Amino acid sequence: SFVEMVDNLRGKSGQGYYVEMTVGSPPQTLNILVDTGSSNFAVGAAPHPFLHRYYQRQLSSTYRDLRKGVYVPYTQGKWEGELGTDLVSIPHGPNVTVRANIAAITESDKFFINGSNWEGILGLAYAEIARPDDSLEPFFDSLVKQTHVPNLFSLQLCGASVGGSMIIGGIDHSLYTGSLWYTPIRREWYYEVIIVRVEINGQDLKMDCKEYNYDKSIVDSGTTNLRLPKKVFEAAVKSIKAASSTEKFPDGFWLGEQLVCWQAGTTPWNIFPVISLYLMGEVTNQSFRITILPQQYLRPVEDVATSQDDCYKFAISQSSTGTVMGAVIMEGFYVVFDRARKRIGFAVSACHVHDEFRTAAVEGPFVTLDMEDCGYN
Ligand SMILES: COCc1cc2cc(c1)C(=O)N[C@H]([C@H](O)CNCc1cccc(C(C)C)c1)Cc1cccc(c1)OCCCCO2
């Protein structure tokens, strides 16, 4: 019954993928950002310059106030609100209705994005990082307890406006090619994984693999960029700089601020390297790798000038809170959040990136010794 859920995600590039949901009786329809990097379900519940619509608790006969406040600070933006429960459905999802925790957003700061077209956020991670604390049952936990939906979902994010699929309750084999490769969920809070090796154009970065996961590595559809710990980010940028030194870039381009542009159709893709992330596998001493094309980490953006050129922003940036495999990494791939088996699966997506001579890939097996040493403690 998964064909009903294919193509149920929309978005604008860099502004988040959202799914249509309804809350309340009678159903109020809202676009909800799909976020594997948090665990709170929350919706605009008051006017805002960037909201075309919002949740009106007064109009819902099934609303229940929880008489508790809540606030969530993300890396980017924050909101506070009022906790309640209400009936929730996903029109292009499974045919079910759950009573779910809902944070009604009454104030926010740099949270809603102008033109993103979504009015709320669906945190799909685990209770441990839910606010105000882990007793607030996240939406997907509610869905699995109250219905027969199996305890897994999958994300096919298609890149640069944008669309994709969230398969709730299973895997749709028509959305990927090749084999699924699985990496363990190291701990059920974020979707934490372990990166065991990093290569740029086939050259090992030759860092202690603890640096890749300092202090954690997560799969986060709510973040746009590949974000890397400071030491790793410097090694990678240095290597990406050297591979493309044929051309000149402002040094604020490497910080994500300034664009770079080229005459339409002349982007020198060949001079940017591929990046390979090796992930811990399912069996002893075994890993696999995912390979990222420059078309994934050079995100296309609107031409700031009066021209019609190809302009790009650098979508690898620095982190002080660990590695974040953002939407830009996920776009190459079909990603299975197999919560029931504590693992995350990767396959080449059917809507994969297209280079002339190079291809995004998920390949294994690889042998990697001492993988447990790559986790940070
Ligand atoms: C250099 O890039 C920075 C950056 C860019 C960015 C979003 C985030 C960060 C962002 O913070 N996104 C969070 C995710 O939940 C974050 N996940 C990890 C996390 C970090 C801190 C605290 C928590 C707890 C709440 C669990 C969780 C979700 C979010 C919040 C606000 C807007 C948004 C998406 O718009 C989606 C489009 C992408 C917008 O671009």
9, part of any domain: no
Q: What are the CA-CA distances from residue 275 to residues 223, 284, 307 (Å)?
A: 19, 24, 31
Give the torsion sign (CA, 154, 174, 194, 257): negative
Asked if 102 and 41 count as a contact pair (C-beta separation under 8 A), the reply is yes
Rounded to whole angstroms, how far apart are CA atoms 250 and 118?
A: 33
The residue assigned the tokens 């080229």 is 262
Phi then psi for 86, rounded to 5 degrees?
Answer: -165, 170
Give the torsion sign (CA, 199, 201, 203, 205): negative
93 and 216, same domain (yes or no): no
End-of-domain residue from the set 122, 149, 176: 149
185 and 135, same domain (yes or no): no
Q: How many residues does the chain have?
A: 377
Number of domains within the chain: 2
Rounded to whole angstroms, how far apart are CA atoms 123 and 138?
A: 7
Smallest CA-to-CA distance from 169 within 1, 349, 341, 29 is with: 1
257 and 346, same domain (yes or no): yes
What's the resolution in A? 2.5
HEC assignment per residue over the chain: CHHHHCCCEEECCCCCEEEEEEECCCCEEEEEEEECCCCCEEEECCCCCCCCCCCCHHHCCCCEEEEEEEEEECCCCEEEEEEEEEEEECCCCCCCCEEEEEEEEEEEECCCCCCCCCCEEEECCCHHHCCCCCCCCCHHHHHHHHCCCCCCEEEEEECCCEEEEEEECCCCHHHEEEEEEEEECCCECCEECCEEEEEECCEECCCCHHHHHCCCEEECCCCCCEEEEHHHHHHHHHHHHHHCCCCCCCCCCCCCCCCEEECCCCCCHHHCCCEEEEEECCCCCEEEEEEECHHHHEEEECCCCCCCCEEEEECEEEECCCEEECHHHHCCEEEEEEHHHCEEEEEEECCCCCCCCCCCEEEEEEECCCHHHHCCC
Catalytic residues: 35, 220
222 and 276, same domain (yes or no): yes
Rounded to whole angstroms, how far apart are CA atoms 194 and 342?
A: 13
117: left (phi over 0), alpha (psi -120 to 50) or beta: left
6, part of any domain: no
Asked if 97 and 88 count as a contact pair (C-beta separation under 8 A), the reply is yes
10, part of any domain: no
238 and 211, same domain (yes or no): yes
Asked if 163 and 10 count as a contact pair (C-beta separation under 8 A), the reply is yes
How buried is residue 320: exposed, middle or buried, by Cβ count under 10 Å (0-12/13-18/19+)?
exposed
3, part of any domain: no
The residue assigned the tokens 């809603």 is 112
Rg for the chain (alpha carbons), in Å? 21
Distance 266 CA to ligand 1 centre (A): 33
Please report, as a single letter, which amino acid is at residue 219.
V
- Residue in 105, 192, 223 to alter for ligand 1 test, most ligand atoms within 8 A of Cβ: 223
**How many CB atoms sit inside 10 A of residue 125's CB?**
26
Range of the domain at 232: 150-377
Peptide bond preceding 215: is omega within 30 degrees of 0, i.e. cis? yes
Strands, sheet with 316-319, edge to edge from the N-terminal-most edge strand: 217-219, 323-325, 226-229, 316-319
- In short, whether 258's Cβ falls inside 6 Å of ligand 1 is no
142 and 154, same domain (yes or no): no
Phi then psi for 116, rounded to 5 degrees?
Answer: -70, -25
127 and 179, same domain (yes or no): no
Give the torsion sign (CA, 194, 197, 200, 205): positive
* Residue minimizing CA distance to atom 31 of ligand 1: 111
- In short, whether 15's Cβ falls inside 6 Å of ligand 1 is yes
End-of-domain residue from the set 79, 114, 149: 149
- In short, whether 223's Cβ falls inside 6 Å of ligand 1 is yes
Phi then psi for 369, rounded to 5 degrees?
Answer: -85, 150
- In short, whether 108's Cβ falls inside 6 Å of ligand 1 is no
91 and 159, same domain (yes or no): no
Q: What are the CA-CA distances from residue 351 to residues 159, 291, 346, 356 (Å)?
A: 8, 15, 14, 16
Rounded to whole angstroms, how far apart are CA atoms 62 and 25?
A: 6
Asked if 89 and 102 count as a contact pair (C-beta separation under 8 A), the reply is no
The residue assigned the tokens 């974000």 is 227
| CATH classification of the domain holding 119 | 2.40.70.10
187 and 270, same domain (yes or no): yes
The residue assigned the tokens 């740099």 is 110
226 and 182, same domain (yes or no): yes
33, part of any domain: yes
Rounded to whole angstroms, how far apart are CA atoms 88 and 20?
A: 11
